[PDB]
Amino acid sequence: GALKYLEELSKKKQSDVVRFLLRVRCWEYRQLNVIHRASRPSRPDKARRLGYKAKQGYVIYRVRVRRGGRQLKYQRSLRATAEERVGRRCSNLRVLNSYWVNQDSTYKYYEVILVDPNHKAIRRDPRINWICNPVHKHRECRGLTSTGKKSRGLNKGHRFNKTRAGRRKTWKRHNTLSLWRYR
Amino acid sequence: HFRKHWQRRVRCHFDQPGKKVTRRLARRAKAAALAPRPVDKLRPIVRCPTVKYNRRTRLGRGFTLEELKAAGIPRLLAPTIGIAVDHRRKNLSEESLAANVQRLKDYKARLILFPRK
Amino acid sequence: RELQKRKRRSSRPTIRMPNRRKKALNPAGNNIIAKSWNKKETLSQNYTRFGLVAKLGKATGGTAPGNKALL
């Protein structure tokens, strides 16, 4: 149940213990590189909930991206930028999923969970050999992660008529003139 | 209503007979694979939603759990013997429950089962 | 287009693809359906000869006069 205790603790973010840990940890990340290998998940409950397993093949990389805006607003998220940069550095791995770990005033810190598609453990284990399949190359670059789905608007209902099933696809379908043989 | 570029977004259906032939060949491919079996699954009878169309019935997605139970067909066996199952639908009425159990009884009366291996 | 011109100009042969299909179009084997299936007939006609129902849904059109396969 320790993961449930950590879930409640992580929901209590501005509490004294979590605030102290986030401060001293933000200083560490600022002393380290902008993108670096994290030996272990800093938030194990979040990692395991997002799909991190303690196998050979699951890697965690931490990244800091500058926050703010370009008054122009970027349509994708800082999560998407961090995921794309981590994937480009680890071009041989598949980006499984990322999560916020620390904010700071000038940067923003995300840990990205990645899977090795070429490792034998990953290849033999189901539940991950789907990411071994070649249709999942650079999901972070194509918007196939959680932040990509959120930004593209993959929800069902009246509030997502234009954006579900692909915005450009829907626009093209609505703007095609269909002419049949017997008109 | 041509303020946009319909010329680069225009589509013609010159392959209507070609797609008809392709779909017919696909139905024969299914019946070559599932040769003694029907090429579809048994679908329930459902009343249309709104006041405009509530006087008529159509075919639904799948049969409900308790109407399968009343018909006497086990849950884990129905999709195997060729009955669509819908866990989202609720009967909410003895009329729909009775209509669908009668349909499943008719399927039972007209079905032939082969004994495993 | 350039690749097609290059192929038509070169002496290398044309790799003619045989008409293979992913899915077979007729039942096969040593079973009753396989031995009684007529490949020059249609699905509905074969099932009408067999005495079996091929479609369990609503008729989407007019059937043949002797069709007994579309419930």
């Binding site: 189901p126 | 003694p36 029907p38 195997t80 399927y107 007209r110 079905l111 089962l113 082969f114 | 079996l52």
Partner: peptide, 21 residues
């Protein structure tokens, strides 16, 4: 394939059947 899927297929595999006209 997973063991649970293997068990489900072992104990409930697609059956051979036909519907009378």
């Amino acid at each position: 394939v997973l063991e649970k899927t293997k068990k489900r297929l072992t104990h409930f595999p697609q059956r051979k059947y036909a519907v009378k006209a």
